[PDB]
């Protein structure tokens, strides 16, 4: 990947919410030497959200004691007693290597999050596990992970949300060590998924109102929905979370945007948040990838995006997404191409493997319009991005690579007004991925695509009528 974070080597997995220290973002992420094997937390730093500097392991795997997802906060006020400004983290670990014993262990750092020390006794015990007898009880005790901590300014205390089987548990604490159980958060459509890597935060909307947001990585594929990140706007009152609407909204409609995490930006923590996700999907994550053979590593993170909460008619709010602005600083060349009308298909006179392409498409009677990226000159390979019916789709099927096929997960789609007769697209193409930001960023589709060396072309196509392709600009991107 030219501009997507990847591990120097090994298996990359769940990113952990970055903390801000030493004037930079300290990102942590699950890492293992063996693909889908046990591991711990590794560390990387980024000043702009694009380029990263890897620092190695920070919370190592220990004999039959791996470290799973969690979160870290800067104890500015020294509420935990490990020193003012100490970086305090909570992570799920299966005690004694026993899955039903998975509980939350605390780790702390006094050097801005570079080295950590472990607290021998877990701060949030899995009592369910030490009583689970029936299959149901055990299955439930085996889903108690990914603690996400948030400082509730209004109540002056720490609140933590933990993922369970189809529900989320909440705990509060004044010192990060002594936690008090609160009321679970239940949602009605369990076909949605069961809550992993939950997110909890406060953000101020474009109208100045403040809001809480509870989210989590799901798996609603069974009901035609994403396997990414869903969120419920609402309020946390210290006892329970009140979702404004029990039907959640989605942040990505692509195949690969899992275990996403968000964090407040440096320049505007209350209104703008940054977000990054592991670009993989458990339907096929456990396998070797092209990069394994070519570079000895497996997995990359998504591009970092900026989020903001916008008010909607009726009084509800929704998040909008956009590529981190800093990406612009890595643009090495900018190519504009003349507007053109095409009826059928046309190959653009440009080739590349890592770039961003923006364009507008307008049509009338056409029943399908789109653009193909990663097009091989032999015409057999390409990823299609277009509008059809009520879908703004991304079809990576024609890009399936022998020995690494992503089939049958080929056509992803975001909802789009079926009456739309034009659309704006901003597409980020890298060596192993395609990320599509639609229109104003309300819908985004992120997916890994295994492009071959020669998959460099771009073509335009329509079905059922001509379309006018305008404002075509391609920005080549170079790494650091």
The CATH number that applies at residue 356 is: 2.60.120.560
Let me know how many helices (H) and strands (E) the chain has, helices first. Answer: 2, 36
* Closest by Cα among 303, 248, 308, 240 to 272: 308
319 and 414 both lie in a single domain: no
Cα first-last separation, the chain:
12
Domain closes at, from 326, 350, 374: 326
Give how far the C-alpha of residue 272 lies from the chain's centroid of Cα atoms, to the nearest Å: 16
* Closest by Cα among 291, 273, 299 to 4: 299
Distance (Å, whole) CA 446 – CA 29: 19
254 and 234 both lie in a single domain: yes
Way it was determined:
X-ray
- Residue-range definition of the domain harbouring residue 298: 1-326
Distance (Å, whole) CA 173 – CA 149: 10
* Closest by Cα among 106, 79, 78 to 92: 106
Domain closes at, from 326, 356, 371: 326
User: The tokens 């392709």 sit on which residue?
Assistant: 469
16 and 50 both lie in a single domain: yes
391 and 461 both lie in a single domain: yes
Domain closes at, from 326, 353, 369: 326
Q: DSSP strand E in 210-330: where? A: 210-217, 229-236, 241-243, 249-250, 258-264, 273-278, 297-298, 305-311, 317-323
Element (H, E) at 291: helix 290-295
301 and 450 both lie in a single domain: no
Alpha helices by DSSP H, 73-174: 135-141
303 and 332 both lie in a single domain: no
Alpha helices by DSSP H, 112-268: 135-141
448 and 465 both lie in a single domain: yes
DSSP letter at 208 equals: S
The region, left, alpha or beta by phi > 0 then psi within -120 to 50, assigned to residue 220 is alpha
19 and 152 both lie in a single domain: yes
389 and 335 both lie in a single domain: yes
Peptide linkage before 408 cis (omega within 30 of 0): yes
* Closest by Cα among 309, 328, 302 to 27: 302
**Resolution value in angstroms:** 2.2
CB contact set of 108 (below 8 Å; sequence gap of 6+): 80, 82, 86, 87, 88, 89, 116, 117, 119
Q: How many domains, the chain?
A: 2
| Encoded tokens for 177 | 């060590």
12 and 105 both lie in a single domain: yes
Distance (Å, whole) CA 257 – CA 197: 12
- The alpha carbon dihedral of 17, 21, 25, 29 has a sign of negative
265 and 333 both lie in a single domain: no
CA-only gyration radius of the chain, Å? 22
User: The tokens 């998959």 sit on which residue?
Assistant: 455
Distance (Å, whole) CA 428 – CA 373: 10
Burial of 285 (0-12, 13-18, 19+ CB in 10 A): middle
Q: Which residues pair with 282 in a beta bridge?
A: none
What is the domain-level CATH number for residue 256? 2.115.10.20
Q: Which residues pair with 15 in a beta bridge?
A: 29
306 and 377 both lie in a single domain: no
User: The tokens 């085996």 sit on which residue?
Assistant: 142
Asked if 48 contacts 335 with a C-beta cutoff of 8 angstroms, the reply is: no
């Amino acid at each position: 990947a030219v501009y997507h974070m990847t591990p120097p080597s090994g298996w990359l997995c769940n990113p952990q919410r970055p903390v801000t220290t030493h004037g930079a973002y300290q990102l942590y992420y699950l890492h293992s030497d063996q693909n889908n094997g046990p591991g711990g937390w590794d560390h990387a730093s980024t000043t702009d959200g694009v380029a990263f500097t890897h620092h190695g392991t920070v919370m190592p795997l220990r004999p039959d004691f791996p470290v799973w997802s969690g979160s870290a906060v800067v104890d500015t006020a020294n509420t935990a007693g490990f020193g003012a400004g100490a970086v305090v983290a909570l992570a799920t670990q299966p005690t004694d290597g026993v899955r039903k014993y998975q509980e939350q262990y605390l780790y702390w750092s006094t050097d801005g999050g570079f080295t950590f020390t472990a607290l021998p006794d877990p701060v949030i015990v899995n009592t369910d596990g030490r009583a689970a007898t029936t299959p149901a009880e055990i299955e439930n005790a085996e889903w108690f992970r990914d603690p996400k901590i948030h400082w509730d300014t209004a109540r002056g205390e720490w609140v933590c949300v933990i993922g369970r089987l189809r529900y989320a548990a909440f705990y509060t604490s004044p010192n990060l060590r002594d936690w008090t159980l609160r009321r679970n958060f239940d949602y009605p459509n369990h076909a949605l998924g069961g809550i992993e890597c939950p997110d909890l935060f406060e953000i101020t909307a474009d109208d100045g109102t403040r809001h809480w947001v509870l989210a989590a990585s799901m798996d609603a594929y069974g009901i035609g929905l994403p396997m990414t990140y869903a969120y419920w706007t609402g309020t946390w009152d210290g006892e329970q979370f009140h979702a404004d609407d029990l039907t959640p909204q989605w942040l990505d409609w692509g195949w690969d945007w899992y275990a996403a995490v968000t964090w407040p930006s440096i320049d505007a923590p209350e209104t703008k948040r940054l977000a990054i996700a592991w670009m993989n999907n458990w339907k096929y994550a456990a396998r070797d990838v092209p990069t394994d053979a070519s570079d000895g590593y497996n997995g990359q993170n998504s591009i970092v995006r900026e989020l903001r909460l916008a008010r909607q008619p009726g009084g509800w709010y929704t998040l909008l997404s956009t590529p981190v602005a800093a990406l612009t600083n890595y643009v090495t060349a900018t190519t504009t191409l003349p507007d053109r009308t095409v009826d059928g298909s046309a190959v653009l006179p440009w080739n590349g493997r890592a770039y961003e392409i923006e364009l507008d498409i307008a049509w009338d009677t056409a029943t399908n319009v789109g653009i193909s990226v990663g097009r091989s000159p032999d015409g057999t390979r390409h990823t299609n991005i277009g509008k059809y019916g009520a879908d703004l789709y991304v079809d990576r099927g024609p890009s399936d690579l022998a020995g690494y096929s992503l089939a049958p997960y080929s056509r992803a789609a975001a909802p789009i007004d079926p009456g739309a007769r034009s659309v704006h697209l901003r597409i980020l193409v890298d060596t192993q991925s395609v990320e599509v930001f639609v229109n104003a960023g309300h819908t985004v589709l992120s997916q890994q695509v295994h492009f071959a060396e020669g998959d460099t072309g771009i073509s335009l196509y329509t079905d059922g009528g001509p379309a006018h392709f305008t404002g075509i600009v391609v920005r080549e991107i170079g790494q650091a």
